[PDB]
Amino acid sequence: RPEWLDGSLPGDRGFDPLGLSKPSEFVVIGVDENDQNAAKNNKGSVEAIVQAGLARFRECELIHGRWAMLACLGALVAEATTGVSWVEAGKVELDGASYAGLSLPFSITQLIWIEVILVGGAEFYRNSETNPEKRCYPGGVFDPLKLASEDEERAFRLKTAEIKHARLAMVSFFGYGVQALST
């Protein structure tokens, strides 16, 4: 069982077969001399041992799973309501733009310009924050029902609910990736 985890975190379990989030030590080697005007150039030396990202890794699972939960819930119902495969969208939308059977006026060239402005600028604003708990869990308009007044630092698990559903949605879309080309 790992020791560098299991506290103040939703998935309090040591699943890691390899310890990707292991805080490792570091040692700093000096820069090698490359001056020709010296007679001898040395290969550098050990200078500084450094004692030493679980906060960075927590944010990056949350983004992938939430895109997966928009993907898995979005591919089952567009296959249900419209009646087209989730891989086939793009081949049938370049020909005719639609949403739930309703024709849309946009050329496919405009969709590149729409998506890199709208989704792009929103992605440029997410990394404009410098607090890792606020980066994982922001406030403001994204919490209209006030989860942030409810605590989870104790045995309360009011935050440990998206994180399990983010996990298998990545897996069920990984199951969609092993099904698309092959089968």
Partner: protein, 59 residues
């Protein structure tokens, strides 16, 4: 190219490659090229540090 004719005709009439004195001569110029590179590199690889890296070691 006149030399090359002289060599090719020589080997037909005298079989110079199968002669041991030509075999020793090849050993003298293959050995003499080995030993020129051998003695030439051991001396070059043992030069006392007298100059910097901005000027040739032949200085």
């Amino acid at each position: 190219s006149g030399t090359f004719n002289f060599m090719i005709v020589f080997q037909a009439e005298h079989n110079i490659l199968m002669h041991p004195f030509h075999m020793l001569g090849v050993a003298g110029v293959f050995g003499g090229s080995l030993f020129s590179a051998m003695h030439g590199s051991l001396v070059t690889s043992s030069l006392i540090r007298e100059t910097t890296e901005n000027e040739s070691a032949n200085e």
